[PDB]
């Protein structure tokens, strides 16, 4: 109903922004920067689990489906959230990983940092180009949680299909709020669902580098236990080609 509205629930369950504790007294190194970012990321993923448990409908899914969706989508959630923070703090000019850890053009020059930061900046630049509202962002972020699935389907497929329909309608409500006409509303829905589809390609490159760093420990970068457990499960499924994106537009 409207007391409370679903969108007000999404606003109140959004986690607070975490700080990194990064020590910038001495110069950066790619190893200590990436290890700091992985540790922050593990803490952000724990917050994302608490968020997902609070999402209306999510706990109607089989527990194994809840585990699968979070394991498959965590990088999309974290990159999208990073895009929003970077949009609000710097209009997408810098990557705001935490309020005490902002990556500018010079830190991107570190070894192995440039290509991954370029992909993350592209996400932030889309929020700028489309002038995404907070409520559009919140609805789109739920849909990312529901956008990467096993090819063999989920245990609670019918529940999942209904959850996805509910939050697609909620994104529509957030669009209509901007007070455009019906034709403008459909065009904006097209633009935002195209952005959602593009996240699979933009995040796929981030995952491949993450997987590479996890497996080969290039420069011996550390991962927290939370990410190491998820990555250890996610990588074989992705490598076997057993995962598929759910797309709004035919590819």
């Amino acid at each position: 109903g409207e007391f409370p509205t679903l969108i007000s629930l999404l606003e109140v369950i959004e986690p607070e922004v975490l700080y990194s504790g990064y020590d910038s007294t001495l110069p950066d190194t790619s190893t200590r920067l990436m290890s700091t970012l992985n540790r922050l990321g593990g803490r952000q993923v724990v917050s994302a689990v608490k968020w997902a448990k609070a999402l209306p409908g999510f706990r109607n899914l089989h527990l194994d489906d809840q585990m699968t969706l979070l394991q498959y989508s965590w990088m999309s959630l974290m990159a999208f959230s990073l895009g929003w923070r970077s949009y609000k703090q710097s209009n997408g000019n810098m990557l705001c990983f935490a309020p005490d850890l902002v990556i500018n053009e010079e830190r991107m020059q570190l070894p192995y940092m440039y290509d991954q930061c370029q992909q993350m900046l592209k996400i932030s630049s889309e929020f700028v180009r489309l002038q995404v509202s907070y409520d559009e962002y919140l609805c789109m972020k739920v849909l990312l949680l529901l956008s990467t699935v096993p090819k063999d389907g989920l245990k609670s497929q019918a529940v999942f299909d209904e959850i996805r329909m509910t939050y697609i309608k909620e994104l529509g409500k957030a669009i209509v709020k901007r007070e455009g006409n019906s034709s403008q509303n459909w065009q904006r829905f097209y633009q935002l669902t195209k952005l959602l589809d593009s996240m699979h390609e933009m995040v796929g490159g981030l995952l491949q580098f993450c997987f590479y760093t996890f497996v080969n420990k290039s420069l011996s970068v550390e991962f927290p236990e939370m990410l190491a457990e998820i990555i250890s499960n996610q990588l074989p499924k992705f490598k076997a080609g057993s995962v598929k994106p759910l797309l709004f537009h035919q590819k």
Binding site: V49, L70, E229
Partner: peptide, 11 residues
């Protein structure tokens, strides 16, 4: 399989 994740989701 992932212990921390399962412990969190089990409440």
């Amino acid at each position: 399989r992932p212990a921390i994740l399962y412990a969190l989701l089990s409440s």
